[PDB]
């Protein structure tokens, strides 16, 4: 139990009621430091621990693909916490109003939440802090090394963040203790009813094709903590050996496919790292996978934590802002509207095929995501519009959307964040360029296009 994983958000007088875990980013019962630290405080206070999840009003800004994935996993989580005598309460509305009301009604003694550097999470914290008088703690349950401990500033490159993260691995990469159940039963609606009403509200905005048929295919990834562990086990046994060799081939399914589970926190990345470290596979493919799930994943939290404007043009490096400004008035080859990007109606068949994998599966290949966003910058009127369009289609149709990985991934493609300067071209400036012929020399672009008609 490392005290560097927990941070105090507000001091106060501890009540004599249950310890409340405001779960948000990490929706899992196992390998949850936030839940484990809440249980330890409750045990030392001779009081039970309870879980409170908030069903926010911002769900209509996404889709059914994300609403169903999250709520189906929360239904499985409700049973898991019930087996540990840990009751869960699912509130509907503003977190600033619901959490403050729950704390006062249930005589909460201490409040704990998990860590997320997103702007919307800091908005909820500001509202909750003003409405409570009990101690308020937060715990980094998503990163192996706490985001405030890995680096005290923003790291501009992966080769500067890698030696800092690996130096702290022997301290923070440890096994998880077992979640002790409550000593006894500690004495607001059914999730199935909340899913039915929310789906009916999202139905008019459902992504459809010409035949009025749904575009999304929900049989590619089954939600839940149990289905997440099966994906990890199958990846280590079948795909890890060839990961470093075929991670850049969109025609092969050699990725772990763990991001939808990782985003909603249905599986701990620290658990995935532990099982991969003890696995005996290709040393080149192991170094490649640990680079993505540790460095690039946690450098995205570093970027969002230390950059308030992580979604804006001001967070770009000075060399990128000066390069893009010098080419702002360059006549773009094409200018597509948001509705043309959304429906995949560009002159690039490779770009259209990437958008149809996004629309149909909700998880577009990691390599084509780089090409998909860089073409948005090439076919937009300004880098600012390219950011809005990329963020919109990302958060709406990706299952792992609305994640620090997405904003840091978009900043890398459009603004060269965590990148270097390259050959100066028109429109795109010194931002790294990915051409269509360059992709034809890396993989079979025809098979990727034909798969997503």
Q: Which residues are annotated as a binding site?
A: 243, 256-259, 292, 363, 369, 394, 400, 405
- Residue tagged 């009604």 (tokens): 105
Q: What H or E segment, with its residue span, contains residue 378?
A: helix 366-378
Task: Report DSSP letters for 4-46, one per residue.
Answer: GGEEEEE-----SS-EEEEESS---SSS-HHHHHHHHHHHHTT
Four-point Cα dihedral 105, 76, 399, 354, nearest 10: -170
List residues forming the annotated binding site for FAD.
243, 256-259, 292, 363, 369, 394, 400, 405
Shortest CB 132 distance to ligand FAD, Å: 31
Cross-strand partners of 110? 19
Shortest CB 195 distance to ligand FAD, Å: 23
Which residues are near ligand FAD by CB under 6 A?
Answer: 247, 255-259, 262-263, 292-293, 296-297, 300, 366, 369-370, 373, 394, 398, 400-401, 403, 405-406, 409-410, 413
Which residue pairs from 203-207 have beta carbons closer than 8 angstroms and sit at least 24 positions apart in sequence?
Answer: 203/64, 205/60, 205/63, 206/63, 206/64, 207/63, 207/359, 207/397
Judge contact between 14 and 110, C-beta under 8 A. yes
Cross-strand partners of 55? 92
Q: How far apart are CA 125 and CA 10, in angstroms?
A: 10
Nearer to ligand FAD, 74 or 255 (CB): 255
Nearer to ligand FAD, 262 or 389 (CB): 262
> Which residues fall within 8 angstroms of residue 367, CB to CB, at 6 or more apart?
247, 248, 249, 250, 442, 443
Q: What is the Rg, in whole angstroms, of the alpha carbon atoms belonging to the chain?
A: 22
Shortest CB 369 distance to ligand FAD, Å: 4
Shortest CB 398 distance to ligand FAD, Å: 5
Closest alpha carbon to 293 in 266, 264, 259:
259
Nearer to ligand FAD, 312 or 366 (CB): 366
Shortest CB 268 distance to ligand FAD, Å: 12
Shortest CB 252 distance to ligand FAD, Å: 12
Shortest CB 253 distance to ligand FAD, Å: 9
């Amino acid at each position: 139990m490392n005290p560097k994983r927990i941070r105090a958000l507000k001091s106060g007088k501890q009540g004599d009621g249950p310890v409340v875990y405001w779960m948000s980013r990490d929706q899992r019962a196992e390998d949850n430091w936030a839940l484990l630290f809440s249980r330890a405080i409750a045990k030392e206070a001779n009081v039970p621990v309870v879980v409170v999840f908030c069903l926010t009003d911002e769900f209509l800004e996404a889709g059914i693909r994300q609403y169903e994935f999250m709520l189906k996993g929360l239904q499985e989580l409700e049973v898991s916490l019930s087996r540990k005598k840990i009751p869960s309460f699912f509130l509907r509305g503003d977190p600033g109003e619901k959490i403050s009301r729950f704390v006062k009604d249930y005589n909460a003694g201490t409040l704990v939440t998990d860590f997320s550097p997103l702007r919307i999470k800091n908005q909820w914290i500001e509202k909750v802090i003003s409405g409570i008088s009990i101690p308020f703690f937060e715990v980094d349950a998503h990163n192996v090394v706490p985001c405030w401990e890995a680096s005290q500033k923003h790291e501009y490159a992966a080769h500067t963040f890698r030696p800092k993260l690996y130096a702290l691995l022997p301290e923070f990469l440890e096994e998880f203790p077992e979640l002790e159940p409550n000593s006894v039963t500690p004495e607001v609606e059914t999730l199935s009813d909340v899913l039915e009403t929310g789906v009916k509200a999202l139905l008019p905005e459902r992504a459809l094709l010409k035949n009025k048929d749904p575009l999304f295919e929900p049989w590619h990834f089954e939600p839940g903590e149990k289905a997440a562990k099966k994906v990890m086990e199958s990846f280590i046994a079948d795909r890890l050996d060839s990961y470093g060799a075929l991670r850049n081939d969109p025609t092969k399914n050699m990725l772990s496919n763990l991001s939808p589970y990782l985003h909603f926190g249905q599986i701990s990345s620290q658990r995935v790292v532990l099982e991969v470290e003890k696995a005996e596979s290709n040393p080149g493919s192991k170094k490649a996978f640990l680079d993505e799930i540790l460095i690039w994943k946690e450098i995205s939290d570093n970027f969002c934590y230390y950059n308030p404007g992580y979604d804006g043009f001001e967070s770009f490096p000075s060399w990128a802002k000066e390069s893009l400004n010098a080419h702002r008035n360059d006549v773009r080859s094409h200018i597509y509207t948001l509705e043309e990007f959304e429906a995949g109606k560009t002159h690039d068949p490779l770009w259209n095929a990437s958008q149809m994998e996004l629309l149909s599966t909700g998880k577009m290949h990691g390599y084509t995501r780089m090409y998909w966003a860089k073409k948005i910058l090439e076919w937009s009127e300004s880098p600012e519009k390219a950011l809005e369009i990329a963020i919109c289609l990302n958060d709406r149709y990706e299952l792992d959307g609305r994640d620090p990985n997405g904003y840091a991934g978009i900043a890398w493609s459009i603004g060269g964040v965590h990148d270097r300067a390259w050959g100066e071209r028109e429109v795109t400036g010194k931002i790294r360029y990915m051409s269509y012929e360059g992709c034809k020399r890396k993989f079979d672009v025809k098979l990727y296009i034909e798969k997503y008609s």
